[PDB]
Amino acid sequence: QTELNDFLLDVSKTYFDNIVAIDSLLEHIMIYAKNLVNADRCALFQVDHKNKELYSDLFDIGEEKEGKPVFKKTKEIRFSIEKGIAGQVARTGEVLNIPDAYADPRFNREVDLYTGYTTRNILCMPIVSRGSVIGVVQMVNKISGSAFSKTDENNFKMFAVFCALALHCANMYHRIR
Amino acid sequence: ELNDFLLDVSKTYFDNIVAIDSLLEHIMIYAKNLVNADRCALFQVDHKNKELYSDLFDIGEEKEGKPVFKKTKEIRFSIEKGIAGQVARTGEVLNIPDAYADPRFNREVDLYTGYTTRNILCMPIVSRGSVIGVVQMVNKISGSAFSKTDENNFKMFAVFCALALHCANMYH
C-alpha cells in the first residue's frame, strides 16, 4: 500500500532531517492515522499535571493545505482531568474506541457545546514519557461510517506503541552527543 | 495490560547498556505479539568477516510474566547463507511462507537448535545506507504464513531497531 510506503519514507526523512524528530513525527503520525482510520478530525491535548487539567495543543478544524491537514495551535480548550474520554485516557493510559460518544457517560459534551461540532465516534490514546501519561491524542468521527472499526482500533493501538517507543528513543538519544 | 505495557515501554534506565537492551527486548516482544510469531531474533552484520551473528534470540522461555531472550553471539554464519543473509546482502524485505521450500533458506540453524522453522518474516535494519542487522519473526502461530498486513506492521517497528542499534554503536 502506497500510503504506508509513503509514511515509512516520511519517518526516515524526519529522523534524517531533524535534531529532535518528536514533533514532526507526532504530526506525521496524526496525519497518517487520520487518513488510515478515515477520521474527520483529530487533536493532541497536553496534560497539565500541576493543575490536574488537559489543554488543547493541536486541534484540527478541517482546514487543509494542499491535500494534507493543517492543525490549529491553541491552548484554549482546557478542562479537568476528571472529565471526558480524554480525561479517562489521561488517568489510566488506556486506548479507547468509543462507538457512540453521547451514549457514553464519561464523554465531555462541553467541547461540542462550545464548537457547534457534533462528536459521534472517538479513538483515544495516551502519549507516555518516563512512566507517566503526558498527553492525549484523539481521532474524531468515522467519515461515512457509524463507528471506528475493529481494524481502526487495532491500528490505533499500534500507533500508541509506536509513539511510546518513539518518545523513549528520543529521551534516549538526547542523552548522547 | 496494553496500558501497563505502554507505561512500561516509556520507563527509562540510567544505565545506558541496560537501557538499550531493555528497549530491544520491548520491541521484539511487541513485534512477536503483533504478528503472532512463535519466535524472533535479531542478527548483526559483521562486515569484515562477511557474516551474520545472533544478538538476541528467542528460545520460547520465560523468567516471569513475559518472553525473555538469549543474549548470545553463538549463531553465526556466512552472509551467503539463509533468508537472513539474503536480506543482509540486498536490503530487501522477505516474507517466506514455507522455509524448507525456499532454496535460500539456511537449514543448518534448525539442525543446531533442534527447532523446526516453517515461515519467516525478515527485515533489514539500515543505518546510513548500510544494512547493519536483520530482524526476524518466525513461525506464525494461528495461520499458515505471515500475511502482507503482518509484514507491513512488522516494518513499522524496524526503525526502532535501527535507532536502538545505532545507539549501542555510538556507545562503543
Ligand SMILES: Nc1ncnc2c1ncn2[C@@H]1O[C@@H]2COP(=O)(O)O[C@H]2[C@H]1O
Ligand atoms: N478536532 C476536534 N474538533 C472538535 N472537537 C474535538 C476535536 N478533537 C476533540 N474534540 C472533542 O473534544 C472532547 C474532549 O472530551 P472528550 O474526549 O469526552 O470528547 C472530545 C471531542 O468531543
Ligand SMILES: Nc1ncnc2c1ncn2[C@@H]1O[C@@H]2COP(=O)(O)O[C@H]2[C@H]1O
Ligand atoms: N528465535 C529463533 N529460534 C529458532 N530458530 C530461529 C530463530 N530465529 C531465527 N531462526 C532460524 O535462524 C535461521 C537463520 O537463517 P534463515 O534466515 O534462512 O532461517 C532462520 C531460522 O530458521
